[PDB]
Amino acid sequence: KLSEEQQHIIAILLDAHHKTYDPTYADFRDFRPPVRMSPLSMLPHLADLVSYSIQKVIGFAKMIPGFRDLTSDDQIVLLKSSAIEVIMLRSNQSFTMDDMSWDCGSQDYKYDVTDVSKAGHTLELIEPLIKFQVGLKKLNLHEEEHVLLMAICIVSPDRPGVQDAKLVEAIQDRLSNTLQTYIRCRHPPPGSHQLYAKMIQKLADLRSLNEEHSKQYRSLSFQPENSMKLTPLVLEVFG
């Protein structure tokens, strides 16, 4: 029941994701090495991982149909506001419900609650992030749904600082209609509505995690000792 336009959107988003997400995690070898002894020994490594991820998210975004047709300032506000959410979302692909960690091809590049702690984040945030990862994994999303959800996340008309909310909504609506139809092609009612509703609740949760973080990254990076351990792109993006 997917039209050609809908199929073309999915195809573009699959390519973009495949181009910007290397399931071998080979590039990780070029980050500052992880250290698990040392206040914030994991901060250099995870800062490099976050920074790299921001670059990749930007790459994915630029391929979202219509995104690059937005103004430069709208593209920036959208990316600054969504980066962390898309990172979290995209990270579900490495996440495993075995031990509740992100497994990027080895023990050295396998990240757990304590690793994240040693990057300067409290368990109080870290735990809701793990829970989110669990809930998302349980959806057993198809890659088609996964990339649509990332794209919906980025092109949200309700992000602070957006000027042409209507244009951003026009893109988002096409993506949401594509996702809904794809879901319908896989699942009759009411399973279809159930799954969609859960995907929407995941985007709400990400907003919440985003808000909560901003307050935390404000106190972490406020410290000059910490901010110095980050990267230029991370400073630019997270203000």
Binding site: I58, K62, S72, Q75, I76, L79, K80, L233, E236
Partner: peptide, 11 residues
């Protein structure tokens, strides 16, 4: 503020 690196990654 200015975002020269994000701008550059977008073009």
């Amino acid at each position: 503020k200015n975002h020269p690196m994000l701008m550059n990654l977008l073009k």
